[PDB]
Every structure is written in C-alpha cells, then in structure tokens.
Amino acid sequence: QTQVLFEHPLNEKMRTWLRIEFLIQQLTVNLPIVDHAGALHFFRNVSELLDVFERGEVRTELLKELDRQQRKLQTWIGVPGVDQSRIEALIQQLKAAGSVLISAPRIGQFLREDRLIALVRQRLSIPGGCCSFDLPTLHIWLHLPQAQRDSQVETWIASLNPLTQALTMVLDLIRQSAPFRKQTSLNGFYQDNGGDADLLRLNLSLDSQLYPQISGHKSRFAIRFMPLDSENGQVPERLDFELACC
C-alpha cells in the first residue's frame, strides 16, 4: 500500500523467467483486441516471446526446476507446524505441469506457424511499418466480428498454457520460499551475499521515490539506490527497507 516492489534476477536463468512471465502477462492485459493499438500490443509481445524462445530450449530448464521444487517441498514433511495437506497438493501440481509441459508440442510453435503473426513480426522491426497500407490483412482482421478475434486470440494464448502453468508455479514457489528480512542502507549503498539465490526482492518506500540499481558479483552483489528524479530527488543517509534472497 505504501511500498514499491522491485525484483532482480541473480542469474541469466531467472532473468529469462521474469521476462517470459512478463511478456505472457501482457498478452491478456488489454483484451479483447478491438483497435489497431491493441493488436500491435499483442503481436509485439508475442514476437518478443518468439525471440527469446529461439535462443534456447526453455522447456528443459523449466522441467529441471519443477523437480527441484518437488524436492524442496518434500523436505518440509514432518516439520511440526507444517500444513502437509497443502504440500502434497503442490507436489502434484508440479508433476501435473511437468507432464503437461512434456506432452505438449514445441514451445510457441503454434504461434510461429500462424500466418498472420508471421506477417506482423516482419514489420515490427520497422518504426512506422505496422500501418494499414503496410498490413492490409491485419486491417481486415480488425474489422471482422469481435467474436472471431476473441476466438483466435484465446487460441493463441492457450497454446502457451503448458509453459504458463509450469512458469507461474515455479516463480510463485520461489517468491514465497524466503521471507523479507529488514535492512538499512546508509549513504545509498548496500552489500551482502546472495548464496544459492536466484531472485532478489526489495520493498522500498513509496515516498522515497528511490529505486535499487543492483549490480552482480559471483554470489554477492551491490545495490545503488538512485532517485527517479535525478534533477530534484534526494538520497538520504538512512534507508530502511526489506530485502529477500529467493
């Protein structure tokens, strides 16, 4: 209510996850697709996902984590106070998402094969290249009955469910595995060890208008708090916040 949430990947792996998570969230944000603006927002995000998918196989590494989490969960059975009824549920959801992720076809393949999305991607690299005279097919597509568009869009988004499921569950688990430890950075500088951490979470004061500019280093790091307004904003000597290495 009065704190801002900042996250930072401590490794290239978590970096690809946070990105793929964001791009997928965007797809369903401005729905339904009614105007040209909305369409661009959609295909653009879809295109970004297809760009990161080419680089490497996100499937394997995401399965690896689903199992890693299954093991983290089972180490909590027996511990007095643990709601083991909730644990067995998660462990099954992980396995469910595991099979679903395996049985499904190559990630984003259905989107790559789509004729429409293919044409739109070509003109995203061009500043003003996604106009009507550049994308006639898209212009017609935006005049068809609203039901038809919702139909195709739903399908496009559905094809990522296997990825969306495993992804949202991995990150959700990691985010809650570690609590927020209160810290105090003086002079706008912080230095600590991350350890076996994949993610950093920071809750800064809404009124400080400051943001963490974290730098990496092996397993440790370095946070440099800077003001949104570099022309008018200040950085005090005392900065009490909340950190959490996940």
Partner: peptide, 12 residues
C-alpha cells in the same frame, strides 16, 4: 523452528 517455515507452507 516454526517461523523458519515459509508462510504459505504454514497453517494447521
């Protein structure tokens, strides 16, 4: 020992 357990794994 009991607070060392993640809040989402912590209930009855």
């Amino acid at each position: 020992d009991y607070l060392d357990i993640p809040a989402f794994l912590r209930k009855q």
